[PDB]
Amino acid sequence: PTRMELTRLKKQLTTATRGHKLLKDKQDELMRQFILLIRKNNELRQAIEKETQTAMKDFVLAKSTVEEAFIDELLALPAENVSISVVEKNIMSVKVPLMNFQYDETLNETPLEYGYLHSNAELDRSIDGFTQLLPKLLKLAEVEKTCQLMAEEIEKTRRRVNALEYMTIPQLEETIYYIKMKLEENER
Amino acid sequence: MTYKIGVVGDKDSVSPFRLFGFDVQHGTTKTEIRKTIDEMAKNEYGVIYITEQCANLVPETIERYKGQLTPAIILIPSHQGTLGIGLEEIQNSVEKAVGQN
């Protein structure tokens, strides 16, 4: 109920009301970026579901003729040792992943070129199918996860915008009035 | 930052990923699949590809990780295709973002 307290609360009110307007602007920008990313998410997922299923079918057909014990031995000899680098990128207040395949770097001078011993054209070609889908599978992972994380952040942001607008700001305003009427009764 | 790739699906469909150093598992039940996913996420896997038929059995587990940076749980078809779940889920993220439920 002092002038010192009034001063403090006034800074909080302008910080809250300015912050409310700018948080809404941030909500709008997240939405704009999310909508673009969602199109890409859909594009990538349709492409992947189609090429992945084709690749799998080709492999099933290819392996159907050859003995199981042969396939088991082929699969136990690695063609690559892929890991993924994941770096954190900020999109305003949300952390999202940037993903990149890390390949075996000691094998740079001899890049992948698939041919198995005593295999056949069809079987090797089906393996090449999988090799080809790899970059788009990583792409889909990164884009889909980002969209999932953005959706969550927009929901969080929306909650805060409403809370600021309808709870924080009116509470601050009310208190500022109480402090004010009390100071103004004194001097009168 | 360096992370492993997991894959959960039927042997016929997902076996070729073994050639690339992906950790390939094959559960058939809710419990089996859920345990596989939690173990991968405990071992700091960056991505888990999961066939839709497997994913169909563990929506609750998948939703738990959705808000986490990793692991990214990505649904894929089997050689028999999809249940439409990956696609429906894109629409669900839209509805979440725009606040339509």
B contacts of A137 (beta carbons < 8 Å): 49, 74, 76
Q: Using the beta-carbon criterion (under 8 Å), do B5 and A154 form an inter-chain contact?
A: no
Query: How many Cβ pairs closer than 8 A exist between chain A and B?
Result: 144
Residue of B nearest to A96 (CA): B69
A contacts of B22 (beta carbons < 8 Å): 82
Structure tokens at A7: 């001063």
Structure tokens at A182: 């009390």
Q: What are phi and psi of A87, to 5 degrees?
A: -110, 145
Domain A1-188 - what CATH class? mainly alpha
Domain map (residue ranges) of chain A: 1-188
Is B65 part of the contact surface with chain A (CB cutoff 8 Å)? no
Contacts of residue A75, Cβ cutoff 8 Å, sequence gap at least 6: B15, B16, B18, B19
Is the Cβ–Cβ distance between B21 and A103 less than 8 Å? no
Is the Cβ–Cβ distance between B68 and A154 less than 8 Å? no
| Radius of gyration from C-alpha coordinates of chain B | 14
Q: What's the CATH number where B73 sits?
A: 3.40.50.10580
Tokens 């969209």 found at: A147
A152: nearest CB among B67, B81, B94? B67
Other Cβ atoms less than 10 A from the Cβ of A79: the count is 19
The angle subtended at Cα A43 by Cα A37 and Cα A46, nearest 5°, is 135
In 3D, which of A107, A94, A106, A108 has the Cα closest to residue A151? A94
- Alpha helices (H) in B16-58, listed in sequence order: 30-42, 52-55
B contacts of A125 (beta carbons < 8 Å): none
Q: Using the beta-carbon criterion (under 8 Å), do B20 and A130 form an inter-chain contact?
A: yes
Give residue B34's domain range. Answer: 2-101
At how many Å resolution was this determined? 2.0
Q: What are phi and psi of B50, to 5 degrees?
A: -140, 125
- Cα separation, A44 vs A139, in Å, equals 8
Angular region, B81: left φ>0, alpha ψ -120 to 50, beta rest: left
Q: How does A143-166 read in b/e, with b if 16+ C-beta sit within 10 Å?
A: bbbbbbbbbbbbeebbebbeebbe
Q: Indicate the residue type of B76.
A: I
- Cα separation, A53 vs A78, in Å, equals 22
Q: Using the beta-carbon criterion (under 8 Å), do B12 and A155 form an inter-chain contact?
A: no
- Cα separation, A2 vs A168, in Å, equals 21
Q: Using the beta-carbon criterion (under 8 Å), do B69 and A137 form an inter-chain contact?
A: no
SS (H, E, C) chain A: CCHHHHHHHHHHHHHHHHHHHHHHHHHHHHHHHHHHHHHHHHHHHHHHHHHHHHHHHHHHHHHCCCCHHHHHHHHCCCCCCCEEEEEEEEECCEEEEEEEEECCHHHCCCCCCCCCCCCCHHHHHHHHHHHHHHHHHHHHHHHHHHHHHHHHHHHHHHHHHHHHHHHHHHHHHHHHHHHHHHHHHHHC
Q: Using the beta-carbon criterion (under 8 Å), do B82 and A53 form an inter-chain contact?
A: yes
Residue of B nearest to A80 (CA): B20
Structure tokens at A18: 């300015």
Angular region, A108: left φ>0, alpha ψ -120 to 50, beta rest: alpha
